Each structure stands twice: as structure tokens, then as C-alpha cells.
Design a protein around this ligand. Structure first.
Ligand code: POV
Ligand code: POV
Ligand code: POV
Ligand code: POV
Ligand code: POV
Ligand code: POV
Ligand code: DU0
Ligand code: DU0
Ligand code: CA
Lengths: 92, 92
């Protein structure tokens, strides 16, 4: 579950923030939002940053249409497979 | 689950509100948000009160960078261990 997290946070932070110099904030932002997604926080109005209801309208740019596809795969893996595999683990 | 709650709400309220005189509001605020976290309310824009998207920008101060680490441990214990232990309880 920690690897699926980094498989998602690093492409997302890279596609949505292309103009970043090296910073310790890059170690938070690859791990912060993808972790809070495991607990039901979808960040609904940050998905599709080019939408009109977006709360990140300045992040709209080339390639950012990829991130909602990425997060759809991410939560399917984490919530629909990995959290329920862990329920199944505990039950058995 | 009520003890993991107080293990989190008391360090959080202490780190984020250092300048408090004794008040009955201290018995609510150690128990209120940590309980609503069990039911999927992450308080996403109150985590990391020093962030730019924060809805508590005045709470930013010394030591407040500890609280997102604390809440990451908190929900892991409550949701990933304790809620699913309780599912496992009921199934068996
Ligand atoms: C057995 C358990 C052991 C733990 C194992 C796991 C290891 C956990 C390791 C995680 C790596 C975190 C590294 C922090 C990066 C530097 C932070 C920094 O510079 O300042 C930040 C620190 O202040 C905060 O408030 C944020 C602290 C991070 C919260 C982590 C919660 C998510 C849990 C994740 C769990 C999933 C882990 C998935 C696998 C990796 C603040 O903001 P900034 O912008 O970064 O800098 C300041 C600038 N500013 C003032 C403009 C805002
Ligand atoms: C079930 C329902 C689906 C029905 C079926 C038919 C599919 C329909 C698809 C049709 C493809 C055409 C869509 C784009 C329209 C034209 C260009 C355009 O407006 O681009 C937009 C984005 O979109 C893109 O840039 C491209 C998006 C392509 C993703 C398509 C997924 C393929 C199907 C499924 C893949 C799943 C996996 C497949 C394996 C099974 C531009 O808008 P923006 O992003 O807001 O940015 C603009 C602002 N900017 C200029 C600042 C950047
Ligand atoms: C079998 C079941 C039995 C129950 C067992 C559990 C014990 C339950 C007991 C919990 C302790 C409650 C102590 C209340 C403190 C005093 C509050 C007060 O005076 O006013 C508040 C009451 O109005 C509210 O809105 C808060 C009421 C608390 C709701 C509980 C929610 C969390 C669930 C709890 C469950 C988790 C417990 C985890 C374990 C501890 C309002 O605001 P204030 O600021 O406080 O005062 C007014 C000032 N102001 C106008 C400026 C706002
Ligand atoms: C997977 C990804 C991680 C990659 C690995 C490398 C780790 C990277 C970390 C590197 C450490 C350096 C980060 C801070 C940068 C310099 C100072 C700074 O800006 O501080 C910031 C906060 O942060 C702190 O004050 C310190 C944060 C330290 C905790 C880092 C986690 C340790 C590893 C994991 C721990 C898990 C458990 C470990 C056991 C397994 C200040 O910013 P702010 O908070 O916004 O407040 C500023 C405003 N104010 C002045 C009003 C207050
Ligand atoms: C699932 C199976 C495959 C099916 C998918 C079929 C292919 C999908 C369909 C179409 C392909 C992508 C093109 C459509 C959208 C283009 C419109 C556009 O400009 O968009 C953006 C740029 O976007 C780009 O420049 C995209 C470049 C290619 C991305 C890499 C391929 C991704 C496929 C992933 C496949 C993963 C498969 C994983 C395998 C398991 C917006 O650009 P702009 O801002 O408007 O430009 C002006 C910028 N300026 C102002 C700064 C100058
Ligand atoms: C997990 C395993 C161990 C690894 C831990 C890694 C250690 C982490 C690394 C380094 C230590 C922490 C400090 C680094 C950041 C300092 C930057 C800073 O100033 O931050 C803040 C202050 O914060 C402080 O002053 C905090 C001082 C130490 C806190 C106690 C240790 C926390 C580690 C717990 C470990 C738990 C272990 C649990 C064991 C299971 C912000 O200050 P400021 O607002 O900028 O100052 C101006 C304020 N003024 C304007 C009011 C004057
Ligand atoms: C197998 C796993 C693959 C993924 C991963 O774990 C192992 O690989 C690690 C390598 C890390 C980076 C190393 C170097 C730096 C440079 C630093 O530069 C300070 C500049 C300035 C501050 O302003 C100093 O004053 C900022 C942090 C950064 C980019 C790291 C980020 C986290 C990364 C990507 C980690 C990530 C979780
Ligand atoms: C084993 C467990 C450890 C944790 C815990 O349970 C047992 O320990 C309890 C002790 C409680 C405090 C006792 C005294 C007061 C003073 C009062 O002062 C009124 C001032 C003014 C109003 O403005 C009057 O006019 C405010 C409340 C406060 C701080 C209590 C808060 C809750 C606490 C921390 C409880 C907490 C849940
Ligand atoms: Ca939820």
C-alpha cells in the first residue's frame, strides 16, 4: 500500500508541478495527498484542475488531464483491492 | 478506540493551541475532531496549518508540523487496524 502510494504521488506531483526546483516540500507532496485519499478524502475539486469548479485553476497546463485517470486507478487499487484484502486478511 | 482518540486529541490541541487558559472548550476540542475522523472526515485543509491551502492559517506556529504525522498514525490505528478488527470481530 505504501508502494502504490508512491507509484501515484510521484507521477501526479510531476505532471501537476513541472517547474519545481529541488525542495524538501517534494518529499511531502508525493506522500501527503495520496495518503489522505486512503481515508476517504477524494480532493474532488482538485481533480481535473482545468475544470470550472476547480480550486487549483493555475495548475491547469499540459498533461494534467492524465491525473484523474491516475487517481481512478489509484483508489481502485487502494480501496477496492488493498483495503478489502486487509479486511479479508483480518477475518481469516 | 476511545483511548487512541485521546492519545491524539490531547497532543494535537496542545501543539496547535498553546495559549489556552482553562476552559470547558478544552474537553470538546480534545474529543470532537478526532471522533469525526473515524467516519471519514479528514479535515484536509486543517492538516498542515502552515500550508497555503490551509483554512487555519493563524494556527501556524512552532511545533505544528508534528500534527500531520500524528494524524497519519491516528487514522492508521483507528481505520486500518481498529475498525477492521471490529469487522473481524463481527464476522467471527
Ligand atoms: C512505522 C511507521 C514509520 C513511518 C513510515 C512512513 C514514512 C513517512 C514519511 C513521510 C515523509 C515526510 C517528509 C517531510 C518532507 C519535508 C517537510 C518539510 O520540509 O516541511 C513540511 C513539514 O511539516 C508538515 O506539517 C508536514 C509533515 C508531513 C506529514 C506527513 C503525513 C502523511 C503520512 C505519510 C505516510 C505514508 C508514507 C508512504 C511511504 C513513504 C511543511 O511544508 P513543506 O512545504 O514541506 O515545507 C515548509 C514550507 N512551507 C512553510 C511553505 C509550507
Ligand atoms: C464510458 C465513457 C467514455 C466513452 C468512450 C469514448 C471515450 C471518449 C474520449 C475521447 C478522446 C478525446 C477527448 C479529448 C477531446 C479533444 C481534446 C480536448 O478537449 O482535450 C481536453 C483534455 O483531454 C485531452 O487532452 C485528451 C483526453 C484523452 C483521454 C481519452 C481516454 C480514452 C478512453 C478511455 C480510456 C480508459 C482506458 C482504456 C482501456 C480500456 C482539453 O481539456 P483539459 O484537460 O481541461 O485542458 C484544457 C486546458 N489547457 C489547454 C490549459 C490544457
Ligand atoms: C455509552 C456512551 C456514553 C458516552 C461515552 C463517551 C463520552 C462522551 C463525552 C464527551 C465529552 C464532551 C464534553 C463537552 C465539553 C463541554 C462543552 C460545552 O460546554 O459546550 C459545547 C457543547 O456543544 C458542542 O457542540 C459539543 C458537544 C460534544 C459533542 C460530542 C462530539 C464528539 C463525540 C464524543 C464521543 C467520543 C468520546 C471518546 C472518549 C472520551 C459547545 O462549545 P464550547 O466551546 O465547549 O462552549 C461554548 C462556547 N462557544 C459558544 C464559544 C462555542
Ligand atoms: C517518503 C518521502 C520522504 C523522503 C525521505 C526524507 C525525509 C524528508 C525530511 C527531511 C527533514 C527536513 C524537512 C524540513 C525542512 C527544513 C525546515 C523546514 O522548512 O521546516 C518546516 C517544517 O518541518 C520541520 O520543522 C521539520 C520536519 C522534520 C520531519 C521530517 C520527517 C522525517 C522522516 C520521516 C518521518 C516518519 C517516521 C520515521 C521512522 C520511519 C517548516 O515549515 P512549516 O511546518 O510549514 O512551518 C513554517 C512556518 N512557521 C515558521 C510559522 C513555523
Ligand atoms: C489504456 C491503454 C491506452 C489507451 C489510451 C490512448 C491514448 C490517449 C489519447 C491520446 C494521446 C494524448 C493526446 C490527446 C490530448 C492532446 C491535447 C493536448 O494538448 O493536451 C495537453 C497536452 O498534452 C500533451 O501534449 C500530450 C502528449 C502525449 C502524452 C503521453 C501519452 C499518454 C497516453 C497514456 C496511455 C497509458 C496506457 C497505459 C497502459 C496500461 C494540453 O496542452 P495545451 O495546454 O492545450 O497546449 C498549450 C500549452 N502551452 C500554452 C504551454 C503552450
Ligand atoms: C520516528 C522515529 C524518530 C525520527 C524523528 C525525526 C526527528 C525530526 C527532526 C528534527 C527534530 C525536530 C526539529 C526540526 C524542525 C525545526 C524547525 C523549526 O523551527 O520548526 C518549528 C519549531 O519546532 C521546534 O522548535 C521543534 C523542536 C523539537 C521538537 C521535539 C522533537 C520532535 C521529534 C519527534 C520524534 C518522534 C519519535 C517517535 C518515536 C516512535 C517552527 O519554528 P518557527 O515558527 O520557524 O520559529 C519561530 C517562532 N517564533 C516566531 C514564535 C519565534
Ligand atoms: C525507492 C524509493 C524511491 C522514491 C524515494 O524513496 C525511495 O526516493 C527518495 C529520494 C528523495 C529525494 C532525494 C533528494 C532530494 C533533494 C532535496 O534537496 C534539498 C534542497 C534544499 C531545500 O530547499 C536544501 O537547502 C529535496 C528532497 C529530495 C528531492 C528528495 C525527495 C524525496 C525522494 C524522492 C525519496 C522518495 C520517497
Ligand atoms: C484518564 C483520562 C485522562 C484525560 C481526561 O479524562 C481522564 O482527564 C480529564 C481531566 C479534564 C480537565 C479537568 C479540569 C478542567 C478545568 C475546567 O476549568 C473550568 C474553567 C472555567 C470555564 O471557562 C470555569 O468557569 C475546564 C475543563 C478541564 C480543563 C478538564 C478538561 C477535560 C479533562 C482533561 C479530562 C480528560 C478527558
Ligand atoms: Ca468517507
Amino acid at each position: 500500500m505504501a508502494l502504490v502510494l508512491l507509484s501515484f504521488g510521484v507521477p501526479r506531483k510531476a505532471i501537476l508541478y513541472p517547474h519545481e526546483e529541488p525542495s524538501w516540500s517534494l518529499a511531502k507532496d508525493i506522500v501527503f495527498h495520496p495518503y489522505w485519499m486512503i481515508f476517504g478524502e477524494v480532493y474532488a475539486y482538485e481533480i481535473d484542475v482545468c475544470a470550472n469548479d476547480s480550486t487549483l485553476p493555475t495548475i491547469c497546463g499540459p498533461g494534467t488531464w492524465l491525473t484523474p485517470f491516475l487517481q481512478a486507478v489509484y483508489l481502485f487499487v487502494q480501496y477496492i483491492i488493498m483495503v478489502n484484502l486487509l479486511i479479508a486478511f483480518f477475518n481469516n
